[PDB]
Amino acid sequence: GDQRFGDLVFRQLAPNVWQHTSYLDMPGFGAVASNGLIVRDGGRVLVVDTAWTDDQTAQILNWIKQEINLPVALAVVTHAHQDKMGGMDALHAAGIATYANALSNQLAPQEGMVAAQHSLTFAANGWVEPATAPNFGPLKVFYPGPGHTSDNITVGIDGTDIAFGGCLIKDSKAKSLGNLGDADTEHYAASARAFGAAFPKASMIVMSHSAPDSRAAITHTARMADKLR
Ligand SMILES: [Zn+2]
Ligand SMILES: [Zn+2]
C-alpha cells in the first residue's frame, strides 16, 4: 500500500523497487504528481528522477535512510524539466553522483535546472554508451528518440519486469499526452514504440504522470501520438 511520508508518497513495486511521488502546484493545472523510482542493488541504492524541488528530494533521501538504510550510489534523471531535475542540488548536497543525457545537461541552465555532474551519450540505436553509465547495475538506459522532449530518456530495470518511460508514456486510459510544450510531434509515436521495443519483456510500465500500468500504456500512448502527425 501507498506510504505517505511528509508530502510525498512511496509505493513498493517489486522486492527491490519503489516508486516515489511528489507534487507541485501548477497554477491553472492543479497539484501535479510526478513519479520516479528507487532501486536497491545489493548494498546500494539507485534513484531515477528527482522530485520537483530540493526539499522534496531531500525527503526522498530521508525515506531511503529510514526504509532501506543503504547509501545512494547514483541518480539518473530523464530530461531537463523540473519534475525530473528540480532537486539536483539536494542530490549534490548529499554527495550523490548524478547523470543525465548530455543534451539534458546542455539544456538544464535555460530550463532553470542545475545540470547533472555526468553526461550520458547514446549509440545510434539508442542504447547508452556503457562507459558513460559506469556502475549502473541493473539500470538499462535507452534513448528512444525525441518525443515528450528532444532529450527524454528511459530506463529498464534488469531482473524485474519494470521499465520506466518517464514523461514519454501515459497510461492506457489517458485522454492526452500531457505537456507537449517542448515535444517533437512528428517523432513522438515512433519514439514511444521504440521504448516498447527496447524493453520487450517489461510487463509493468512506470511513468511520470500516471500510475503503473500494463504495456497498453505504450500502445495507447503511441496511438494518441499518431494523431499529432
Ligand atoms: Zn517534461
Ligand atoms: Zn513530466
From Swiss-Prot:
It is found in: Periplasm. Its EC number is 3.5.2.6. GO terms for cellular component: periplasmic space. Inhibits by captopril, thiorphan, dimercaprol and tiopronin. This enzyme is not susceptible to inactivation by the beta-lactamase-blocking agents clavulanic acid. Coiled coil: none annotated. GO terms for molecular function: beta-lactamase activity; zinc ion binding. Substrate binds at residues 170, 179. Binds 2 Zn(2+) ions per subunit. Its cofactor is Zn(2+). Zn(2+) 2 binds at residues 83, 167, 209. It comes from the Bacteria. Belongs to the metallo-beta-lactamase superfamily. Class-B beta-lactamase family. Monomer. Confers resistance to the different beta-lactams antibiotics (penicillin, cephalosporin and carbapenem) via the hydrolysis of the beta-lactam ring. Does not confer resistance to the polymixin colistin or the fluoroquinolone ciprofloxacin. Enterobacteriaceae carrying this gene (identified by PCR) have been isolated in Sweden, India, Pakistan, Bangladesh, England, Scotland, Northern Ireland, Australia and the USA. The organisms they were identified in were K.pneumoniae, Enterobacter cloacae, E.coli, Proteus spp, Citrobacter freundii, Morganella morganii, Providencia spp and Klebsille oxytoca. In India most isolates were from community-acquired infections rather than hospital-acquired infections, indicating the gene is widespread in the environment. This is Metallo-beta-lactamase type 2. It comes from Klebsiella pneumoniae. The gene is blaNDM-1. The chain holds residues 42 to 270 of 270 of the full protein.
